[PDB]
């Protein structure tokens, strides 16, 4: 189907405790494949998926150089942002960046991204045109002016439409065993008495990849959204994900409730009921 490649970056200042820590990770879809941490003993970008291990020494050297240089520019950026926000040097602050591409089944660019956040808030984002910017505030407009002057968007567009897309195609081929395999959810319903008057029904989805899934409960065919406890999809640690959805069911109503499961690894959505 469609696919994505994303790089995530976080720098966190720590005044009086050395220089900001820089951590970046790369994903294809929901698969982590590279990481770099400036607090490592010998910081290098390191593989995290089997299909990237075959890249040769020039790849790792180049990627490591890019990471180290971004750690440095982020430290300069944290200093600039203290100025732009009139902040003191005393506190810890955070700078986040994400960029990458989404492609369709034919490998063509669907959308590119490049966006930043400061202290957990949107700061500046490249728009979907890959040519203009959305600045969150008057500080980010100062950045936008500089990036317009320097034609930064054009350099990002060139990467996002070219290299980004081409790397993702390469990775999807080299990783075709796993990146191009959906693992469907393993599903079941459990029953948990609460009192004489009610019990929880919990609908489980386990072992699935990728992470996107829809789990819902209906009663007499009506969605129970407001009355469903839906936990965040969570990693199992074996590449796969888990999720559950629970409803509080009055005594004797169990067969009126149905759980519905949608996932790309399922040829047809599933319907499940409690089976005593």
């Amino acid at each position: 189907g469609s696919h994505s490649m994303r790089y995530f970056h976080t720098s966190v200042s720590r005044p009086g405790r050395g220089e900001p820590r820089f951590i970046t990770v790369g994903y294809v879809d929901d698969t982590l494949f590279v990481r770099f941490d400036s607090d490592a003993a010998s910081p290098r970008e390191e593989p995290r998926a089997p299909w990237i291990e075959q890249e040769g020494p020039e790849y790792w050297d180049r990627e490591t150089q890019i990471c180290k240089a971004k750690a440095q520019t982020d430290r300069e950026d944290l200093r600039t942002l203290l100025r732009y926000y009139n902040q003191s040097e005393a506190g810890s602050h955070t700078l986040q960046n994400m960029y990458g591409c989404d492609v369709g089944p034919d490998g063509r660019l669907l959308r590119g991204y490049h966006q930043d956040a400061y202290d957990g808030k949107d700061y500046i984002a490249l728009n979907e045109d890959l040519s203009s910017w959305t600045a969150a505030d008057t500080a980010a407009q100062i950045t936008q002016r500089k990036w317009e002057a320097a034609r930064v968007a054009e350099q990002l567009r060139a990467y996002l439409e070219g290299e980004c897309v081409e790397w993702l195609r390469r990775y999807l081929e080299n990783g075709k065993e796993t990146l191009q395999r959906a693992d469907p959810p393993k599903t079941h319903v459990t029953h948990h008495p609460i009192s004489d008057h009610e019990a929880t029904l919990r609908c489980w989805a386990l072992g699935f990849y990728p992470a996107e899934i829809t789990l819902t409960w209906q009663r007499d065919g009506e969605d129970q959204t407001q009355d469903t406890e839906l936990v965040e999809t969570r990693p199992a640690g074996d590449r796969t994900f888990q999720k559950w959805a629970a409803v509080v069911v009055p005594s004797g109503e169990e067969q009126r409730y149905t759980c519905h499961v949608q996932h790309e690894g399922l040829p047809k959505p599933l319907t499940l009921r409690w089976e005593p």
């Binding site: 976080t10 951590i23 990481r35 955070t94 640690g237």
Partner: protein, 100 residues
């Protein structure tokens, strides 16, 4: 400074079977700032050598981490996750429940 308190889930990699080796996970998500402390506990005492994922974040910029260790559940042993973050006035302890 904005702050977002962590969501916390403590759970196993596979459905628990007493006496069968498994992994105990604590997934913390939705939080800001990124400074967070997470322990895994066995009968109230910290488990040594717990590993964790590298810091990453969601579409909304909020951070997430997975802490994990091998464990072999039994009928009587109690497991938990203890989290500290600036949004919390005291550490939050979430007990492991094999039915969640």
């Amino acid at each position: 400074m904005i702050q977002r308190t962590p969501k916390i889930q403590v759970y196993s990699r596979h459905p628990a079977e007493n006496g069968k080796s498994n992994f105990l996970n604590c997934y913390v998500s939705g939080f800001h700032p990124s400074d967070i402390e997470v322990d895994l506990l066995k009968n109230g005492e910290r488990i040594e050598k717990v590993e964790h994922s590298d810091l990453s974040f969601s579409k909304d910029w909020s951070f997430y981490l997975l802490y994990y260790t091998e464990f072999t559940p039994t009928e009587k042993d109690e497991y938990a996750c203890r989290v500290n973050h600036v949004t919390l006035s005291q550490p939050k302890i979430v007990k492991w429940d094999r039915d969640m």
